[PDB]
Write an enzyme that holds these catalytic residues in place. Structure first.
Site, PDB file in Angstrom:
ATOM      1  N   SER A   3       0.653  -1.079  -0.305  1.00  0.00           N
ATOM      2  CA  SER A   3      -0.248   0.602  -0.151  1.00  0.00           C
ATOM      3  C   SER A   3       1.075   1.238   0.171  1.00  0.00           C
ATOM      4  O   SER A   3       1.581   1.370   0.759  1.00  0.00           O
ATOM      5  CB  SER A   3      -0.898   0.299   0.600  1.00  0.00           C
ATOM      6  OG  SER A   3      -1.750   1.328   1.147  1.00  0.00           O
ATOM      7  N   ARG A   4       0.771   2.109  -0.530  1.00  0.00           N
ATOM      8  CA  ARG A   4       1.865   2.960  -1.273  1.00  0.00           C
ATOM      9  C   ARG A   4       1.320   4.153  -0.277  1.00  0.00           C
ATOM     10  O   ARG A   4       2.008   4.682  -0.471  1.00  0.00           O
ATOM     11  CB  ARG A   4       1.662   3.441  -2.682  1.00  0.00           C
ATOM     12  CG  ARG A   4       2.695   2.940  -3.657  1.00  0.00           C
ATOM     13  CD  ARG A   4       2.242   3.007  -5.029  1.00  0.00           C
ATOM     14  NE  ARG A   4       3.250   2.053  -5.820  1.00  0.00           N
ATOM     15  CZ  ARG A   4       2.926   1.515  -6.896  1.00  0.00           C
ATOM     16  NH1 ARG A   4       1.816   1.941  -7.403  1.00  0.00           N
ATOM     17  NH2 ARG A   4       3.999   0.984  -7.893  1.00  0.00           N
ATOM     18  N   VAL A   5       0.050   4.114   0.503  1.00  0.00           N
ATOM     19  CA  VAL A   5       0.334   5.748   1.348  1.00  0.00           C
ATOM     20  C   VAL A   5       0.523   4.805   2.524  1.00  0.00           C
ATOM     21  O   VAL A   5       0.995   5.446   3.225  1.00  0.00           O
ATOM     22  CB  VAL A   5      -1.356   5.764   1.397  1.00  0.00           C
ATOM     23  CG1 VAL A   5      -2.341   4.604   2.304  1.00  0.00           C
ATOM     24  CG2 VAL A   5      -1.971   7.154   2.277  1.00  0.00           C
TER      25      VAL A   5
END
Ligand SMILES: Nc1ncnc2c1ncn2[C@@H]1O[C@H](COP(=O)(O)OP(=O)(O)O)[C@@H](O)[C@H]1O
Ligand SMILES: Nc1ncnc2c1ncn2[C@@H]1O[C@H](COP(=O)(O)OP(=O)(O)O)[C@@H](O)[C@H]1O
Ligand SMILES: [Mg+2]
Lengths: 55, 192, 458, 64, 460, 118
Positions: B118-120
């Site tokens: 998850s890039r967040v």
């Protein structure tokens, strides 16, 4: 008794590793048939897509 | 919003393209399928409060709007290298990978922790969960690095046997029953 | 009132006056030598031309023949009168008895029931088969599919299910043979007629010898007969012998219909052709259809587009495999790929669910060791993991069962195993209470009792 | 009846089919490579005495 | 008088348009003036409207549109007969060496039909090559096909020269060597290695090499074959060498792509099996004579399932594989007795004594192959005494499969030997039946018959 | 173009391209739309020529200099499909990042044994 058990340990590891080398050898000869089958299928699918897509 | 099998929308659009005799592509998919999924998924956005005021003509002040997307894709035999998955994996901000070996071995949900991203990241977590999950990541990382020896576990030194047996336990802890959701307090408690 | 202008294989092009062109799916008629040939139009090309598929031998057709436009779609006899008799795709009687005294005929192309009308049923259906009703139990009014390669048991399993649920069932039954052997159709017809159950079964047969159009529409012809009994308020059994042939017949014709090929040569409309059929074979509030469908997978590739697109349309999926059938383990169901929508703690109880999941876990753990066992031999496995292997193999053998329809092959008499009686045996094998018994005690036995009894004889 | 190689019949049909520019399928075989062998092998059959009577205009009774 | 006109030129494919009733027939030859030299075109297809599609047997650069084309009324025709022995020719039968014209009297078309069903020989003979290893472990049928799967640095060219010599001397047959698609360097040094061993007067060479347009590499094999057929009709037993059949397949694939035909199995032409068959079905033993063939085969990607090897192996009768190892030990010829095979090894064709002698030596060697590994790991004296005898006999058999060639005298100095089959069977029965255990393994090496191994041991 | 304008003033700009992989995908899409016959893995035929048209303008002339840093996604970690396979011919250094290192916590997550430079 300890020393004889050590010599038997070595003589048993030897035959175990011989059998494992032979089983790996007999497994390469299956993985390569699967590999050739997949190579041929990929060539065929790509070339058929191109040709039968054109026109 | 949850899009169930965007990989069936891709097939319907392929049918429409091939019936209109449009130039085929790879796996007979049309060229502009990336542009089909991209302009769909780029609508899931969080908008600042000034855009919401301008849109509602001043009726709603000081509130951000948001739309979250969870597109679902099906891969034949785990091949991420196909025309549709290799596009949607590039468009999205993350990837939850569900694997059939884990599902069969009892690990349900079957998320693969080592190949999912998850890039967040921590920005989307309550600070208690952000604090606690850091140790879960590293426990599972060391466990995935040592897993090769799980078949020769008897030979190992006890200094690593502890890491492997902590990894197996944190892996058994992430299993969960269906329709049994946990509030954030319970998840934080169990991870603690 | 129309002329033929092309004859390519199974597809025929016919030119009509601009003001009389038939509609899509209407049926035309020609004289092919002495015989009368029925065409079904698929497309309205421009300029009064219409392109059709011949429901019969296309040989002998000249250009310029005169074809007549029948102004209605293909219509089949339907209802009670069609019961115990064999029929064509065109609804003509194929046994040598007389006419079918039908009171009504239905078009074989129909819209699926509205979403409002559907119904859902948790009522479990019990079969005499251990693996099917442990790993993949299925419910009255639901879809079942037997996936497998060529020659693995997916027809024998369907005949066993017919035996176990169809004779003990009140309502009528419908059996559609789509593109399979005529020998098997004759054998089934005679087995039925010799036990006087034929007067409860309606048969439709477009077997493998017939040209593509018959195999293409015979499945719809059967679904119509089934839909009728459904809408009459009854509950029906629908057995389709091979639904793969329905799409293979579409693939054979697609390119001639002038349509760009797709993923592996399949028609571009594969998923729609498959959905437009399987959406009308369902249960509803006014009646229920219980259906078992054999699904051939080509070249044993479970990722080929045709099985891959069929998986989504079934509730309980049973996946047969050649690597098990080659072990003599029949039925060859693959427990790590079979599943069911009905395998939930709520539906089947905590005990059944837990036994099924434990069996899956053990067999998978055994799969994970199969390569280390292959390279390094079994003596390198930890003592805990040598127990797992022996229990896994005992479970592998205990899933085998003798069938009443397979006495012809093995000679041993068949067995009917109740569910209560099989979850107990697997709980026992897993918990270890039978962990002192040779593996071959479990090969081809009905219940655990018979295994402990067979062990006395070795 | 013995068909010495129905693998070489399939190859010759694949040739005839590709020379007509017909879209191929798996392993470059045509779509109807199954129907090719199906309509052939489905003739090897055993027929009841009524078929033999009706076919032979009643010259042969009771045989199969 | 010329009647056609070039209308298209695309790579090697040229289209010419004739009057509507003078359209050439397929495989007919045409010619054009490509500047200061003529160029021959072979018809491949007839399109509608008097247009015909051809492939140029030469470089097509310099061709305008509208050049006049003269329609030869016959296929490509080459010179045949005794006159072609020792010469070098290209696909069109033109002397490519500089020694001038070929003095033939008769010319044959290269496109022909295989012998009819009732011309074939109603018997099944064997060809005595004269080499021990081949005659024992992989006998040749007269009129059969033999694949030669050896690699490089193992002696393929000297094996070919020995077969040529023996089949010219100890029989009364000639030979033909077709150089389909291989390096020019090997062709030149083969020409020399043959001219300095006096076998050049016994072979007819035709060369179409890697530097040639596709049409030449395609039809050169048919040129060689149609000279071999002329030699057959004289009643001789002939031998035909093909330098690489895989390149005869690939040239047809290139041509088929040039013509725009749809691809097939794994990139090959759709007509792969028929193109291979119409060649391999012309070299058979007829009631008048016979053509034997030794063909070098190259297996792509090390895959014996690829369509080209799979299509070729349908036609090969024998198979001799050369091995770098067997050469390293110093045994020449370098044939591998365990991998070489022949479908002539059956009691019903070769007899029971030859069959079981070959199977004997095979079992002996394939046991020794692992007793030697047991030695390599555990040392010699770990063996049993029965096994030591097995090793001591296997080494002798392995040595006795060597032979001195008349062609190899320039390396070994020893005079070449031609060993009849009976003598090889006797020698190997003796070595395997426990006779001759009393003389050392170096008494067998490079000897010839066993009656010479005894004499070599006498003086050792 | 903006970087080249700055260069022609005698400056040393630095040009950041956020993903070469999507430049190649845009080329593939544009080529498929125009109906050109596809190449090895669906990639347009002009793949290497587009890559050269881009990369051959990033150079340090005698008047100025353009340096570049370029992110390049490796699909399925294969390093061999034509896009990264064709980009390597132009790069002067390669920094490889691994998710395994990142998961142990040590960002920047550069792999020191696989990173290289001419
Ligand atoms: N319970 C069983 N006992 C013995 N043999 C079986 C059993 N089930 C299947 N078979 C074997 O399965 C083989 C394949 O038959 P069939 O099921 O008709 O193939 P297909 O899958 O094409 O229908 C049969 O010849 C039969 O021996
Ligand atoms: N019968 C033989 N006697 C002696 N030496 C040989 C014999 N056969 C092959 N050789 C040696 O093996 C080497 C291989 O040479 P060559 O035949 O040119 O390679 P290739 O066969 O791969 O073209 C030669 O240098 C030759 O000296
Ligand atoms: Mg069947």
């Amino acid at each position: 008794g300890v020393v004889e058990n050590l010599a038997s340990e070595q003589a048993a590891r030897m035959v175990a590793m011989k059998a494992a080398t032979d089983n790996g050898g007999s497994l390469i000869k299956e993985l390569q048939l699967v590999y050739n089958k997949a190579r041929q299928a990929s060539i065929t699918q790509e070339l058929t897509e191109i040709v039968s897509g054109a026109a | 919003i949850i899009y169930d099998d965007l990989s069936k929308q891709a097939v319907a659009y392929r049918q429409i393209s091939l019936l209109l005799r449009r130039p085929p592509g790879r796996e007979a998919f049309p060229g502009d399928v990336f542009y089909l999924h991209s302009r769909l998924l780029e609508r899931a956005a969080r908008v600042n409060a000034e855009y919401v005021e301008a849109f509602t003509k001043g009726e709603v002040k000081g509130k951000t709007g948001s739309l979250t997307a969870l597109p679902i894709i099906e891969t034949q035999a785990g091949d991420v290298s196909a025309f549709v998955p290799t596009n949607v994996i590039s468009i999205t901000d993350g990837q939850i990978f569900l694997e059939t070996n884990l599902f069969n071995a009892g690990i349900r949900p079957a998320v693969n922790p080592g190949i999912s991203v998850s890039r967040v990241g921590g920005a989307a977590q309550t600070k208690i969960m952000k604090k606690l999950s850091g140790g879960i990541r590293t426990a599972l990382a060391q466990y995935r690095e040592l897993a090769a020896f799980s078949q020769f576990a008897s030979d190992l030194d006890d200094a690593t046997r502890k890491q492997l047996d902590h990894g197996q336990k944190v892996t058994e802890l992430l299993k969960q029953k269906q329709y049994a959701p946990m509030s954030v307090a319970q998840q934080s408690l169990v991870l603690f | 009132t129309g002329k033929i202008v092309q004859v390519i294989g199974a597809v025929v092009d016919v030119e009509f006056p601009q003001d009389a062109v038939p509609r899509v799916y209407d049926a035309l008629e020609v004289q092919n030598g002495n015989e009368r040939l029925v065409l079904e139009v698929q497309q309205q090309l421009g300029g009064g031309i219409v392109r059709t598929i011949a429901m019969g031998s296309s040989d002998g057709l000249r250009r310029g023949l005169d074809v007549k436009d029948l102004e209605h779609p293909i219509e089949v006899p339907v209802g009670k009168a069609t019961l115990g008799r064999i029929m064509n795709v065109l609804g003509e009687p194929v046994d040598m008895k007389g006419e079918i005294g039908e009171e009504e005929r239905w078009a074989i192309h129909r819209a699926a029931p509205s979403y409002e009308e559907l119904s859902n049923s948790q009522e479990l259906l019990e079969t005499g088969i251990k693996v099917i009703d442990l790993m993949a139990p299925f419910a009255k009014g639901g879809k079942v599919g037997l996936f497998g390669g060529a020659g693995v048991g997916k027809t024998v399993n369907m005949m066993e299910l017919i035996r176990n649920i169809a004779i003990e069932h009140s309502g009528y039954s419908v059996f559609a043979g789509v593109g399979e052997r005529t020998r098997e159709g004759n054998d089934f017809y005679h087995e039925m007629t010799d036990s006087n159950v034929i007067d409860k079964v309606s048969l439709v047969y477009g077997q493998m010898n017939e040209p593509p159009g018959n195999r293409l529409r015979v499945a719809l012809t059967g679904l119509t007969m089934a839909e009728k009994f459904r809408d009459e308020g009854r509950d029906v059994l629908l057995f389709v012998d091979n639904i793969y042939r329905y799409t293979l017949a579409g693939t054979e014709v697609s390119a001639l219909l002038g349509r760009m090929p797709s993923a592996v040569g399949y028609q571009p409309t594969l998923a729609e052709e498959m959905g437009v059929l399987q959406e009308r074979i369902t249960s509803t509030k006014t009646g229920s259809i219980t259906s078992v469908q054999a699904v051939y997978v080509p070249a044993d590739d479970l990722t080929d587009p045709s099985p891959a697109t069929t998986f989504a349309h079934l509730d309980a999926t049973v996946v047969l495999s050649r690597q098990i059938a080659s072990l003599g383990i029949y039925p060859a169901v693959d427990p790590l790929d079979s599943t069911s929508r009905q395998l939930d703690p709520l539906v089947v109880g905590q005990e059944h669910y837990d036994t099924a999941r434990g069996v899956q876990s053990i067999l998978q753990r055994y799969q994970e060791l199969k390569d280390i066992i292959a390279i390094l031999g079994m003596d390198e496995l930890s003592e805990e993991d040598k127990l797992v292997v022996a229990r896994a193999r005992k479970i592998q053998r205990f899933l085998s069962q003798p069938f009443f329809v397979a006495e012809v092959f093995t000679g041993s008499p068949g067995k009917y195993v109740s569910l209560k009686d099989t979850i107990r045996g697997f709980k026992g094998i897993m918990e270890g209470e039978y962990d002192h018994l040779p593996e071959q005690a479990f090969y081809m036995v009905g219940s655990i009792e018979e295994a402990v009894e067979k062990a006395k004889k070795l």
